[PDB]
Amino acid sequence: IGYWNEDDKFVPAQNRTYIVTTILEDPYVMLKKNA
């Protein structure tokens, strides 16, 4: 990660599909005929 020194102080050295949540409540979300 880095090195410590006396003079210094620890000196260092496809768009993802978005998951959507919903709930079953007619008509907001329903299962299509022949799911």
Side-chain angles (χ1 to χ4, degrees), residues 1-5 10-13 16-25 27-31 35:
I1 292 156
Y3 64 110
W4 193 81
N5 195 308
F10 170 51
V11 300
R16 54 182 300 267
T17 74
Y18 284 100
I19 300 95
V20 179
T21 56
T22 61
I23 190 174
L24 302 200
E25 190 76 87
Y28 304 107
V29 187
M30 298 173 296
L31 293 170

